[PDB]
Symmetry: C3
Subunit: 149 residues, 3 copies
């Protein structure tokens, strides 16, 4: 399966309709932080490790990533424009005893590998816990993406 069809499959599996947010400069796309919202309605709200568990937090990370990918696909028409996801910053709304930030971020990284593949899905990342996020969201993720020239 190619990148755009794989995207469609992940979108159907999650059960959401995903189809300034992004600025392009010098072959790079800078993307605003994305919370797990669709239309407006924030989809996974709460504090990870208290009222949100690890599985749900990974889901939230997946949704934020799919939103970013949808924004790219809408702006450029196809995910074939992605050369590399250079950087992914994951901010997790959690308790002060939660230590599984890597596993939560794996929920986003897996989406990248599933849609972009072994090589193009490679990315650097940072994962930290914050004490709150916009509209009580549980995860927020931003990206810098290299675009194919």
């Amino acid at each position: 399966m190619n990148r755009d069809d794989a995207f469609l499959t992940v979108q159907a599996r999650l059960g959401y309709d995903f189809s300034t947010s992004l600025i392009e400069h010098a072959g790079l796309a800078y993307m605003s932080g994305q919370i797990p919202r669709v239309e407006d309605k924030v989809q996974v709200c709460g504090k990870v490790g208290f009222d949100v568990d690890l599985s749900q937090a990974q889901l939230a990370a997946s949704i934020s990533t799919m939103r970013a990918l949808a924004i790219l696909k809408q702006h450029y028409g196809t995910l074939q424009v992605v050369e590399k996801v250079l950087q992914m910053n994951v901010f997790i709304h959690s308790t002060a005893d939660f230590t599984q930030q890597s596993e939560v971020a794996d929920g986003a990284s897996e989406i990248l590998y599933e849609i972009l593949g072994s090589d193009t899905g490679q990315h650097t990342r940072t994962s930290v816990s914050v004490c709150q996020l916009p509209k009580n969201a549980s995860v927020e993720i931003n990206f810098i993406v290299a675009l194919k020239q």
Copy 2:
């Protein structure tokens, strides 16, 4: 048109003078990377405390405005004029808040609005991220960093 006079006007409206182990700004390949700015002006961090506890939404928006004006003053000092700005590529807003504060977007609007008023809706467009942190240098309420594309 006249971004520098607009900057001076915001400085007058806010009532602070901005024309007063790391580096504030580094340029590479036509981009200026800027260090995180807390609201320090005329010495003294201006709006200290925890948003949603001893700092309210309006004061937090002011704090965001001050951090942004600080960044613009640094740009004006390095490049002589805000006409050097092609685009604010990225603005990261870190808000020192309580665990029930969910209006991070409204706090960040205090910075974004300054960018739009001074630079215009075109050169003022920017991506942004706004998250709550549990503390900041010198008990500051907001800290903001930037990546700015430069003209020519």
Copy 3:
């Protein structure tokens, strides 16, 4: 004499051996993006805990130093030598701390000093952001990421 010798000297001074699903470093257009580094060396996240509670300022500075040395070791492994570094464009420092900790700048100085000691006051110049977070992977006390310009 050069930066690699300085790295070995600082490594001896610190007393850890650094030569021993994401990617640590990706290069694009002459920039190396680096993942956030917690103070992991000799298969132990070193230090760990909440700064201002069970980690004091000195230990947090050591943690910041270890994360920085890790980043430098990754660059040296990828490129064979630290002579490829032109500038550390950006260093973001996230500190696991209490809600009363306000010395984030002093913690980040532990990283900045490593950069200056190994790379020099010129190549070691960097912009920086330092904020407190409420937790980190594996209960770590500091996590640091980097954007580094390469000489070309």
